[PDB]
Design a protein around this ligand. Structure first.
Ligand SMILES: *[C@@H]1O[C@H](CO)[C@@H](O[C@@H]2O[C@H](CO)[C@@H](O)[C@H](O)[C@H]2NC(C)=O)[C@H](O)[C@H]1NC(C)=O
Ligand SMILES: *[C@@H]1O[C@H](CO)[C@@H](O)[C@H](O)[C@H]1NC(C)=O
Ligand SMILES: CNCc1nn(C)c2ccccc12
Ligand SMILES: CNCc1nn(C)c2ccccc12
Ligand SMILES: CNCc1nn(C)c2ccccc12
Ligand SMILES: [Cl-]
Ligand SMILES: [Fe+3]
Ligand SMILES: [Fe+3]
Ligand code: NA
Length: 302
């Protein structure tokens, strides 16, 4: 066969704080992710943040971990698939240290620190993949701290500077055949929040300079694929719980960058399915109904 690494990227799936602690959308995506894993396989699942609506969890023993996560994603095919997690703005209104500590309670939950590096070998090959999981809230500010619901400035300047220095160092030294970067906030998005100026200003030049394959995010509650004139990809998968049809920020993205968008208000949402082989990275957007909406490939760089 062809060596392949496969994973699901889902964002903004965090249910609700009132009973039954999930939405119809979250359950449809849990069912649809289970079908994809059953039929096509997943080595892991990437959460793009906003893991517990609307104010996160209060400590590692918070019931929401079982009510909104464990019990929800409980279908047989999903039961032992590892999750690699980062935080969104609603998580940061609550206790993010609790979500990190929860890694030692639940085997499949992996969240060792606010930001960190993942390394993978495509099985049966020497081809390698690095994913850098970012905390865009501590870097840019918590959008929910502001009436604008934009991340206007970071809560702690040292922590922000420290993370940016780490990204810069890691991206310059990364030797892997594929490099992905993931964060809750978008770089580009046509939808209700739109582009994050903090990330456009500070992260995007690093993605370009160091030849990153793609940036993955959620935060806007819809599905988008964007690509710039250099081939850098932007996978936005933020439709695990909510579907916002907004195109408020369409004119804030450079012309031609938007290659796909799905935001239908009546849809149950969806997620992204990533396949990386020694020849290409493929991304398939899958609606909670099971249907494939869009597929695109990003070539390997030598
Ligand atoms: C955030 O969550 C962490 C982790 O659950 C809490 O840390 C716990 O705090 C109390 C004692 O201070 C005990 O339950 C444990 O000894 C602590 N666990 C760890 C891993 O440190 C922390 O108190 C929470 N913070 C807030 C503000 O709620
Ligand atoms: C990596 O593995 C591929 C397998 O096709 C091989 O072509 C290449 O020589 C290897 N690179 C090395 C050994 O540096
Ligand atoms: C903790 N700081 C919050 C804050 N600062 N500023 C200037 C604001 C303006 C509008 C809404 C919220 C804020
Ligand atoms: C397409 N809308 C661009 C825009 N202009 N302004 C003043 C904003 C304030 C908050 C969020 C977005 C915007
Ligand atoms: C329905 N929300 C996403 C969406 N907007 N538009 C104008 C589309 C056209 C074709 C396929 C999908 C879409
Ligand atoms: Cl912004
Ligand atoms: Fe969200
Ligand atoms: Fe968010
Ligand atoms: Na917090």
């Amino acid at each position: 066969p062809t060596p392949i690494l496969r994973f699901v990227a889902v964002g903004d799936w965090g249910g609700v704080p009132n009973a039954p602690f999930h939405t119809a959308r979250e359950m449809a995506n849990a069912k649809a992710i289970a079908t994809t894993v059953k039929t096509l396989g997943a080595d892991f699942i990437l959460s793009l943040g906003d893991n517990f609506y609307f104010t996160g969890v209060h400590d590692a023993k918070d019931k929401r971990f079982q009510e909104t996560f464990e019990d929800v994603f409980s279908d047989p095919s999903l039961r032992n698939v590892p999750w690699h997690v980062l935080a969104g703005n609603h998580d940061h209104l609550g206790n993010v240290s609790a979500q990190i500590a929860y890694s030692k309670i639940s085997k499949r939950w992996n969240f060792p620190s606010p930001y960190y590096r993942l390394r993978f070998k495509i099985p049966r090959s020497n081809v390698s993949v690095a994913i850098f999981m970012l905390d865009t809230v501590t870097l840019c500010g918590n959008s929910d701290d502001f009436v604008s619901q934009q991340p206007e400035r970071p809560r702690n300047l040292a922590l922000a500077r420290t993370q940016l220095a780490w990204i810069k160092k890691q991206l310059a030294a990364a030797k892997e055949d594929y490099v992905l970067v993931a964060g809750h906030y978008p770089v580009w998005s046509i939808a209700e929040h739109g582009p994050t100026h903090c990330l456009v200003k500070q992260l995007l030049p690093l993605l370009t300079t160091h030849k990153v394959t793609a940036y993955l995010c959620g935060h806007d509650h819809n599905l988008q694929y964007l690509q710039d004139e250099n081939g850098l990809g932007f996978v936005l998968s933020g439709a695990g719980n909510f579907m916002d049809p907004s195109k408020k920020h369409l004119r804030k993205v450079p012309n031609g960058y938007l290659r796909f968008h799905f935001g239908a208000e009546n849809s149950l949402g969806g997620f992204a399915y990533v396949e990386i082989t020694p020849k290409e990275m493929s991304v398939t957007y899958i609606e909670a109904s099971g249907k494939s909406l869009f597929k695109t490939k990003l070539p390997r760089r030598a």
